[PDB]
Amino acid sequence: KRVFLAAIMKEQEKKRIEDLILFLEEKGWEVDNNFMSPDQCTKLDYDAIKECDLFIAFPGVPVSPGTHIEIGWASAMGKKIILLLAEYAYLIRGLHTVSNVHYIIYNKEKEYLQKLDLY
Amino acid sequence: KRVFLAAMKEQEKKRIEDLILFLEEKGWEVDNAFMSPDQCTKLDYDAIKECDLFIAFPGVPVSPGTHIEIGWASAMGKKIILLLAEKENYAYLIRGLHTVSNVHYIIYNKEKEYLQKLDLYL
Numbered sequence: 001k002r003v004f005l006a007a008i009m010k011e012q013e014k015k016r017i018e019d020l021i022l023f024l025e026e027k028g029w030e031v032d033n034n035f036m037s038p039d040q041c042t043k044l045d046y047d048a049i050k051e052c053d054l055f056i057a058f059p060g061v062p063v064s065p066g067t068h069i070e071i072g073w074a075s076a077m078g079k080k081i082i083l084l085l086a087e088y089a090y091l092i093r094g095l096h097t098v099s100n101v102h103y104i105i106y107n108k109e110k111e112y113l114q115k116l117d118l119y
Numbered sequence: 120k121r122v123f124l125a126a127m128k129e130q131e132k133k134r135i136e137d138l139i140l141f142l143e144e145k146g147w148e149v150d151n152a153f154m155s156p157d158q159c160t161k162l163d164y165d166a167i168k169e170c171d172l173f174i175a176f177p178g179v180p181v182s183p184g185t186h187i188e189i190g191w192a193s194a195m196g197k198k199i200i201l202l203l204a205e206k207e208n209y210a211y212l213i214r215g216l217h218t219v220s221n222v223h224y225i226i227y228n229k230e231k232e233y234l235q236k237l238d239l240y241l
Binding site: 037038046064065066069071076088091 | 157161
C-alpha cells in the first residue's frame with residue numbers, strides 16, 4: 001500500500017497536506033512523500049511514482065509544472081490516479097479515457113477527505 | 120519518421136508553422152492531422168505513443184497539457200527535445216528530466232537560434 005502524493009497563506013497548503021498524509025497513513029497506506037539537486041529530485045519522484053500503487057494530485061491554478069509532469073508519468077505507467085479538483089485543462093478532464101483516473105470535486109478540505117474515505 | 124509537437128499570440132502561431140515546415144522539409148511527419156476533451160486527450164496520447172521524436176516548449180505561462188504530454192513521452196521512453204528560452208531557473212523536474220529519459224535541451228533567445236541548433240541536432 002504505497003501512495004505518491006504529488007505536492008503567509010502557504011500555511012493553509014501545508015496544513016492540508018499533513019492532514020492528508022495522516023489520513024492516508026491511518027488507513028494503512030505508506031506515503032512516498034534537505035540538500036538535493038534537480039537531477040536527484042526528478043530521479044526520486046519518478047521511482048516513487050513507478051513503485052506506488054495509488055497516485056494522488058492537486059491539479060489547479062497556479063499550474064504546477066512538476067505536478068502535471070508527474071500526472072503524465074502516472075497515467076503513462078498505468079497507475080491508479082485520483083485527481084482532487086476544486087470547483088480546467090482539456091487533458092485533465094479527458095485523462096480518464098487513457099488511464100484509471102477517479103475525479104473528486106470539492107469546495108472545502110473536509111469535503112474531499114470524506115469523499116476520499118468513501119472511495 | 121513521425122514527430123509530435125506539443126503546442127502577441129500571432130507570434131506563437133508563426134513560430135509553430137515555421138517549425139512544422141522546418142520538420143517536414145527534413146523528411147519528418149508532424150502528428151497534427153470541434154471535439155471533446157475525451158477525444159483530444161485520446162488523440163494526443165496515441166500520437167505521442169506512435170511518434171519517434173517529441174518536441175515541446177516548456178516555459179511561462181505553464182501549460183498543463185504540455186507538461187502532462189512531457190510526462191507521457193518521458194515515461195514511454197520517447198526521444199524528447201525541450202526548447203527552453205533563457206531563462207531558463209525553470210522547474211526541477213524539467214532540468215533533471217534527462218536522468219530518466221532520452222532528453223536533449225536546446226537553449227535559445229530567438230527563433231532563428233533554436234531552428235539552427237535543431238538542424239544541427241538532427
